[PDB]
Design an enzyme around this catalytic site. Structure first.
Site, PDB file in Angstrom:
ATOM      1  N   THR A 246       0.842  -1.189   0.000  1.00  0.00           N
ATOM      2  CA  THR A 246       0.000   0.000   0.000  1.00  0.00           C
ATOM      3  C   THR A 246       0.883   1.247   0.000  1.00  0.00           C
ATOM      4  OG1 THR A 246      -1.791   1.191   1.136  1.00  0.00           O
ATOM      5  CG2 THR A 246      -0.172   0.049   2.510  1.00  0.00           C
ATOM      6  N   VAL A 296       8.667   6.389   0.318  1.00  0.00           N
ATOM      7  CA  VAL A 296       7.526   7.206  -0.082  1.00  0.00           C
ATOM      8  C   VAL A 296       8.031   8.312  -0.994  1.00  0.00           C
ATOM      9  CG1 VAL A 296       5.675   8.757   0.650  1.00  0.00           C
ATOM     10  CG2 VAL A 296       6.237   6.755   2.044  1.00  0.00           C
ATOM     11  N   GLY A 297       7.593   8.308  -2.247  1.00  0.00           N
ATOM     12  CA  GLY A 297       8.057   9.300  -3.200  1.00  0.00           C
ATOM     13  C   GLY A 297       9.217   9.017  -4.156  1.00  0.00           C
ATOM     14  N   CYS A 302       5.737   8.048  -9.174  1.00  0.00           N
ATOM     15  CA  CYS A 302       5.134   8.555  -7.947  1.00  0.00           C
ATOM     16  C   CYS A 302       5.091  10.083  -7.907  1.00  0.00           C
ATOM     17  CB  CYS A 302       5.899   8.019  -6.736  1.00  0.00           C
ATOM     18  SG  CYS A 302       5.156   8.399  -5.141  1.00  0.00           S
TER      19      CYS A 302
HETATM   20  N1  LIG Z   1       2.588   6.420  -5.197  1.00  0.00           N
HETATM   21  C1  LIG Z   1       2.807   5.594  -6.211  1.00  0.00           C
HETATM   22  N2  LIG Z   1       3.864   4.755  -6.085  1.00  0.00           N
HETATM   23  C2  LIG Z   1       4.082   3.919  -7.116  1.00  0.00           C
HETATM   24  C3  LIG Z   1       3.251   3.957  -8.204  1.00  0.00           C
HETATM   25  N3  LIG Z   1       3.677   3.021  -9.108  1.00  0.00           N
HETATM   26  C4  LIG Z   1       4.761   2.410  -8.580  1.00  0.00           C
HETATM   27  N4  LIG Z   1       5.023   2.963  -7.341  1.00  0.00           N
HETATM   28  C5  LIG Z   1       6.119   2.582  -6.427  1.00  0.00           C
HETATM   29  O1  LIG Z   1       7.351   2.789  -7.085  1.00  0.00           O
HETATM   30  C6  LIG Z   1       8.152   1.590  -7.014  1.00  0.00           C
HETATM   31  C7  LIG Z   1       9.078   1.530  -8.208  1.00  0.00           C
HETATM   32  O2  LIG Z   1       9.466   2.833  -8.626  1.00  0.00           O
HETATM   33  P1  LIG Z   1      10.709   3.049  -9.594  1.00  0.00           P
HETATM   34  O3  LIG Z   1      11.690   1.986  -9.197  1.00  0.00           O
HETATM   35  O4  LIG Z   1      10.156   2.830 -11.072  1.00  0.00           O
HETATM   36  O5  LIG Z   1      11.179   4.546  -9.362  1.00  0.00           O
HETATM   37  C8  LIG Z   1       7.118   0.484  -6.896  1.00  0.00           C
HETATM   38  O6  LIG Z   1       7.650  -0.719  -6.375  1.00  0.00           O
HETATM   39  C9  LIG Z   1       6.048   1.112  -6.005  1.00  0.00           C
HETATM   40  O7  LIG Z   1       6.427   1.020  -4.641  1.00  0.00           O
HETATM   41  C10 LIG Z   1       2.192   4.850  -8.249  1.00  0.00           C
HETATM   42  O8  LIG Z   1       1.457   4.862  -9.246  1.00  0.00           O
HETATM   43  N5  LIG Z   1       1.945   5.683  -7.262  1.00  0.00           N
END
Ligand SMILES: Nc1nc2c(ncn2[C@@H]2O[C@H](COP(=O)(O)O)[C@@H](O)[C@H]2O)c(=O)[nH]1
Ligand SMILES: Nc1nc2c(ncn2[C@@H]2O[C@H](COP(=O)(O)O)[C@@H](O)[C@H]2O)c(=O)[nH]1
Ligand SMILES: Nc1nc2c(ncn2[C@@H]2O[C@H](COP(=O)(O)O)[C@@H](O)[C@H]2O)c(=O)[nH]1
Ligand SMILES: Nc1nc2c(ncn2[C@@H]2O[C@H](COP(=O)(O)O)[C@@H](O)[C@H]2O)c(=O)[nH]1
Lengths: 468, 440, 473, 447
Positions: A246, A296-297, A302
């Site tokens: 979540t 977070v972020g 995100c």
């Molecule tokens: N708040 C938010 N977090 C996301 C979303 N999609 C993916 N994430 C988070 O971003 C992580 C991966 O981000 P990345 O590695 O591409 O920067 C995921 O495992 C998940 O925790 C989103 O649509 N909203």
């Protein structure tokens, strides 16, 4: 974790705000470093594929697990398709890889589009389970799209029995015009294919497997609805690891979710939510979670920080949480915001057992999304965030959908030379292995213990050459 | 306000320098948090529109207040005008919106409505985005019924057959999300502003008669003798209306303005929007540090603080409320909407935008007319871009309120006062703010 | 046909070089014009879909035939596919259109791509043969592409028995939430789908049908190999019209082909080759061809002019070929180089009985080519030339890989071009509305009540330089 | 009309295909030339504003009417709209123009947006009728209404501002007169109706009942009636002309569109005094790309003007007018007037709202009449409807008013007459010598 003398920043730290200092090193080679993880995830390399529909498919699950990583299937995916995916993966061979299979009556148009869903650069024409020939991207160029495999397939290909030695098939493909070797079961049906480069990786990477020696796969669950019942079904589906996910990890609904799944005594390792703090890290583990996902972020999809203002620099978050998990007898997953192999190594140095890689892998061939192009004919895939599936929960669909997080989009361009995800695993693991030798660590636990770190300014990050 | 360990900065913090840290929360969803303000402004959402002329019109005052905000009207406006705009705004329906209409594109883009009603003697002769082919509905109709019937424009008719207004799809949705900001009579709330120059008592007293629900005594430098005397003059008449006063970044000034009889203190100098004062003077202060200090100073006396200036993103709104502000004032970001007085212009890329202008000298203190006029602060300007899809301010209100609501669930606050009490913040670096996906 | 006095150019004319002069007209509306053809194609409107793999599919076949056009299946297409295509088309309803089918367990990714295989803008969700939900283009947005259809498809929709009058379904759709009207057989199974515009067109367009009342479809053959056996096989496969096609129609190998097919007595209309000359038109008709397809070089995928230098301006080619065909009691198909409805009207005014349209129609939904999106993310599709399939080769049977590569070196390569969809209306029927609207107007401008009168009553004139620049694109 | 010896091309000619050959001239100056039209249209200059929703508004009709031109209001407009439009135009002064109204309470930005609705470049701030001041481009000069524009001219010379606020004898303003506006008063002569104020026309389609619509429009104040359709040689036009003429409205009757002499004869013999001429040259006309039907405008005007004059009729050149050369060439082709289309939509006075460009230069939007020019019930005909074409006409960054384009147009024609030696437009047609040129010929000079 220790910082250079005089370095105690007045702000929390990002991956770009810090660097590793080389210490005394007795490690001879990079291959002398054991990248296996101690968190019980089962990954022989410190890479976890994030649970996202734009990222984790059945194909991504196969190719990554074979190279030692793990793929978490996205939540809210129908139990029938979950069970079908895990069966597909655990039926895969550890050495040879499942090719893109075609039928002689398929159109070259379909053939050309299906070819890009895997990094082999070639497809195998099959009749019933048995390869009758190979189709290469070069042979699909300049022909009629709706002519059906009429003259395409060469029908002459180098073939070897399944379970042969990767070094011999490596030699069989040396003088061969095509880099692909079809591998067949003793009954004659297709076992899979192995590229000359694929044979090499088999000696480097150790596959991530269960007790049967079957490729590992995980799955994710939201905290909405009945969590216990949902998690119970995915356990019986054969998922080796469970992820309770979540947006806000520290919550009443989240703690009750872990308690609900843990009350079933499924014996599976539990990954829990997203928290950037030690107090949240402490509560999730106390709730019965073995591992905690942290951030977070930082996620590329995100928008949380620009919207809510909530968030925290990921490095400091991982450092603090890894400390909390270590004392409570647990581990931490670094989740989100990994652009470069440096972010992987820095996350491990921060004390994270495993790093969760997101949309970065959406820019590969094995990504579930369709491969697109530019007017410049540059290959790319569009990555999307999990959006509402990461949140907590007709007229209502439009109203609640108004304030709800909109699904974010970004363009991840494929590497025009090597587009496969395994090629990204080459860049990641090679970088981390060098990080270990720079510090002088023979493994990941030694890395976190022996690492010496420092803080830099904006001008500090600009040092060096930007990668391809 | 609480900060992380070792995070005491060697510099003052802007909105970009800080972040909110999550904590244990029993609050499930964004709809369970109360956005109502305790400062006595009457807003159901913590959003105030600036008193610039480039932003607050009659259309802006109607649109925002209906969604629960409030619009303070510019100074240097003839009281005859402020009265008619107040009369216009207070004559509006709380659900249905006023369409752009003329006798049988630049006008069509003045509102977030996708269409314009062609009207003859009050009765619609149909729409321009065609007589009975669109959808009608009598006033008093529930928004859900209008929503269902539109399954994007529904013309609302008065019982006599004339045109009462129009309700769109999202407009029907939003009737049940936002609680309108209304006075005792159930009419949309609206506020007015005054300079400290001339007679402030008569100006303020006259605005209270104009129907202003809130009074704003505004000047470029909030801490000074002429301001203190000016607040004293207004409070002496005891109009009973809420008083917000001046602009000051210091804790002492915030108190000085309150002691003069002002209930609320507007806080900031120099980050601005159309404000060149930082580049002109050099006088100012980072907004977060300013608000955090001033908010705390006011709470001690039982007062409140309006965070004023430097809000680009919904992020800045949540941070200001976390900084202890009861409300936030957004000047320029709302100049980039449909409802702003300036018409819609386009540019090189097909993306839209609008040109924003500053108050400048109007916030400051025939031979003398030209001589003192030469030093007028020149032609403040900038380009605020529309969202290529939804150009309405209510869509920005969606963003802002969606963010802040989610911020509260993150911190675990059930309301705005609890947000400031339960919040933990920390300082970030350059690359720290670069984390995450940007906004469109 | 006659030209304005003083106009006798020293150069042959293209479509851009000529214009139609208005004349006295007793024709009130465009709807009073009869677009039916006298050539025996069976088409109720003067449009033929060219034989190319990038344009003529199974979907193009039924969609165009229902509106009165006809579609020629590309040569060297497997007969198994032709018979499969013919059977599919001739099983289509004359009013109700074949919809896009989805399953409750399908992905939105699959749903959205299959959605664009038709111009409906909506896709019916089916459960055990019985319709349950309906998926709309707008209904997939901001949703996870891999989500299932259960939470997507909206089950509130208008219904009506199969065989319902097009006028009723139109009025049923006025108050409807969605433009589509799903057709259901009394047993509950899905009969098909009819849109609002589809209902309107049913009152406008009249289907082109065979002896048994089934949608007409044609097929093409090259002159290499055994032509008699291929033509015979396609005729028995259900082809209502045969087209013998090659790049150069004036050569002996073509003459033998027409004589070979016509000697079988298929009782079917014969279209033969491509010739830009009057002598060619005669010789092909004298070879047993009923119809003569005309052009060399005007084709959008055609590199003949830049390669060989061979070709002829299409307008001057058609006016000469049509005139020679009428004297022999035959007809001429204008083939290639149609950008605009102007080129369709001019072709007819030039005396052509029918107009064959190529890559223009590749830019539609019903085109077999997959839908693509560019930088600006506007819809488009790729069109391809038939290349070597239109050319003549020697007997390649039992050749050598060396000879196979040898003949392949000088072989004509497949040309490519990007054909953009109209972002608003992307169906081929929308182009048919566009084309027929223009041609019908030309008839009223000339004062013709039908196509034969158009050719007879038309006065033409020549323009140069700024002449073409007049008007709006 | 006689082309140069040896020039007899194999094609019909557009405006860009021809040029005027100068000849001996005793005509000294441009102001000695008479631009008056002999067709009884009432225009003092050979300019007719085309009937389109994108060009002719109430503001466009006022501005050109005082400069001698005429506006044809687009057809199928509500009779309530045309009356109010006419009532506005018929309410306008002959000399002084109408200002843009402001008020002390309005804003800085809105004042600038409303300013662009006129070419004044200045707006009058008014209080309960009394002007309190002015805003100029980036106090006021006042004079009583109906003063001598030459006197007002002098007052504005000594002024910092170039506009004069005109005050009615009891107090407050009738309007405003610029310096240039005062100059044009000595140049242009307003086109007037039978009531002594600004003349205006109206367009009617041939569908439905024409006579009743023409009766309604005539009683609504239209001084000239235009029967307009895409194809004028059709039989339903003959019905339309004979219908309107039988009403004896005593108004000039212009009819349809024909590129042929045969069409020109039939419509005139049907009772049409003037024949409007063209098919396809229109900027908003997609007919040629759709139908393939059309004809080069110059050759169309030449043949039709000769046929009309033989019957004692006249010809309006309609469509394809880009540059002032097109206006002169049309008159040189024998046209009594020239109809100007979307080119005027690129002015200030156009009803179209003003946009901003990539280069930050002003441009306005123009759009076609489409089906209104043509010949469940609505949906069936609506599917075959010709899509409304869209083009972008950019204003001149310096002079954006339509009067400025009239200055261009009337300057070129008056100069064209001096080249051929003509003292007027009839003499222009008889004294002109023409020639044919290639693409390179048209490229000569400074665009
Ligand atoms: N708040 C938010 N977090 C996301 C979303 N999609 C993916 N994430 C988070 O971003 C992580 C991966 O981000 P990345 O590695 O591409 O920067 C995921 O495992 C998940 O925790 C989103 O649509 N909203
Ligand atoms: N210092 C300064 N502030 C201004 C000026 N003009 C407007 N403002 C203030 O700027 C605020 C808007 O800033 P924003 O929140 O859009 O960044 C309004 O509250 C308004 O009072 C100016 O010229 N100088
Ligand atoms: N030379 C040549 N002509 C072609 C080729 N493909 C199609 N054509 C011609 O072009 C016509 C269609 O042209 P279009 O209507 O797309 O401009 C076909 O009917 C055929 O006559 C090709 O590959 N080479
Ligand atoms: N067929 C057609 N003709 C038009 C349309 N709009 C304007 N026209 C014609 O084109 C003329 C405009 O001329 P231009 O804009 O080239 O100076 C009009 O007066 C009218 O005759 C249209 O939408 N369809």
């Amino acid at each position: 974790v220790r910082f250079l003398d005089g370095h105690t920043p007045a702000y929390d730290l990002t991956y770009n705000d810090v660097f590793v200092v080389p210490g005394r090193s007795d490690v001879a080679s990079r291959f002398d470093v054991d990248l296996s993880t101690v968190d019980g995830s089962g990954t022989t390399i410190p890479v976890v594929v994030a649970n996202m529909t734009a990222v984790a498919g059945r194909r991504m699950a196969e190719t990554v697990a074979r190279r030692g990583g793990i793929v978490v299937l996205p939540q809210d995916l129908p139990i029938t398709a979950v069970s079908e995916t895990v069966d597909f993966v655990k039926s895969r061979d550890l050495v040879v890889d499942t090719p893109v299979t075609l039928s002689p009556e398929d159109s070259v148009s379909d053939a050309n589009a299906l070819l890009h869903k895997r990094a082999h650069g070639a497809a195998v024409v099959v009749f019933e389970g048995r390869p009758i020939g190979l189709v290469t991207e070069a042979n699909c160029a300049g022909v009629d799209r709706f002519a059906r495999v009429r003259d395409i397939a060469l029908s002459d290909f180098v073939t070897a029995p399944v379970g042969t030695d990767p070094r011999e098939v490596f030699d069989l493909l040396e003088h061969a015009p095509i880099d692909v070797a079809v591998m067949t079961a003793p009954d004659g049906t297709l076992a899979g294919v192995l590229t000359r480069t694929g044979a090499i990786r088999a000696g480097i990477y150790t596959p991530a497997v269960d007790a049967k020696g079957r490729l590992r796969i995980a799955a994710a669950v939201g905290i909405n609805g009945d969590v216990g019942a949902k998690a119970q079904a995915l356990a019986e589906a054969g998922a080796d690891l469970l992820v309770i996910d979540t947006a806000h990890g520290h919550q009443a609904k989240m703690l009750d979710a872990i308690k609900a799944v843990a009350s079933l005594d499924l014996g599976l390792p539990l990954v829990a939510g997203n928290v950037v703090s030690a107090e949240g890290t402490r509560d999730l583990i106390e709730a019965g979670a073995s591992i905690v996902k942290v951030g977070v972020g930082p996620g590329a999809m995100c928008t949380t920080r620009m919207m809510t203002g909530v968030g925290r620099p990921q490095f400091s978050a991982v450092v603090e949480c890894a400390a909390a998990a270590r004392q409570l007898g647990g581990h931490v997953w670094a989740d989100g915001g990994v652009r470069h192999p440096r972010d992987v190594a820095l996350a491990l140095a921060a004390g994270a057992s495993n790093v969760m890689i997101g949309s970065w892998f959406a820019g590969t061939y094995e990504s579930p999304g369709d491969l697109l192009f530019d007017r410049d004919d540059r290959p790319y895939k569009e990555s999307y965030g999990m959006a509402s599936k990461r949140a907590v929960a007709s007229f209502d669909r439009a109203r609640k959908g108004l304030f709800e997080e909109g699904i974010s989009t970004s363009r991840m361009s494929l590497d025009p030379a090597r587009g496969g995800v395994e090629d990204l695993l080459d860049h990641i693991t090679s970088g981390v292995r060098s990080t270990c030798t720079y510090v002088g660590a023979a493994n990941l636990p030694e890395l976190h213990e022996k690492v010496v770190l420092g803080v830099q300014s904006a001008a500090g990050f600009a040092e060096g050459h930007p990668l391809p």
